[PDB]
Amino acid sequence: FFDELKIDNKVDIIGNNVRGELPNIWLQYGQFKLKASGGDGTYSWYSENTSIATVDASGKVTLNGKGSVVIKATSGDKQTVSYTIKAPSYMIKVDKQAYYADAMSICKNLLPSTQTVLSDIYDSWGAANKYSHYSSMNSITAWIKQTSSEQRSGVSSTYNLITQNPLPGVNVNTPNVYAVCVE
């Protein structure tokens, strides 16, 4: 005989091995295991809006779009338990490689206002290549909105999403630099 079915409040981030509430700042395509308990112990997972996110048979969730969505779990004894996903203050998207100005526009003038905006993601999710969608990369250098003075010097600084290598004085016309957006 079974007892109440639950989905643990604390998610388990795939890329940094940390158990705590779902981060409020999201990297796109980050993923994370949900812990379902109770019932006859046999669980089935379901997203009710893939556009925003996805979940697999084991409960590994993958953030795909910015929004709010309801992942649900159902057991064998026929109980169901929803785990709501809150809209994140911000979510970071990695677009194609482009020069700084060329990028600024791709991201619709929404580049990371500062380095923090990005390092903060690293602390929350970790080395971005510890995820499905990114696996094939050692590095993902990302432009940072340039300070007013950097503007005059045709340069700007950067931060990587895997290596955390903050680099300054980068000419705005240096190739091999992704145009990471922040919506």
Residue numbers in the entry: 752 to 934
From the article:
Intimin, an out membrane protein expressed by EHEC and EPEC, is required for intimate attachment to the host cell and formation of the A/E lesions.
Crystals of EHEC Int188 and IntN916Y diffract X-rays at 2.8 Å and 2.6 Å, respectively. R-free values were separately refined to 29.6% and 26.8%. These two versions of intimin (Int188 and IntN916Y) were crystallized in space group C2 and P212121, respectively. Topological analysis suggest that Int188 is composed of sixteen beta-sheets together with four alpha-helices, which can be supported by the crystal structure. Both topological and structural evidence indicate that Int188 can be obviously categorized into two independent domains (Domain I& Domain II). The Ig-like domain at the N-terminus of Int188 is composed of beta-sheet sandwiches which contain eleven anti-parallel beta-sheets (A, A′, A″, A″′, B, B′, C, D, E, F and G) and ten coils. A C-type lectin-like domain was found to be located at its C-terminus, comprised of two anti-parallel beta-sheets (B, C, D and A, E) spaced by four alpha-helices (I, II, III and IV). C932 in the C-terminal strand E forms a disulfide bond with the C858 in helix I. Strand E and strand A in N-terminus of Domain II form the principal strands of the first sheet.
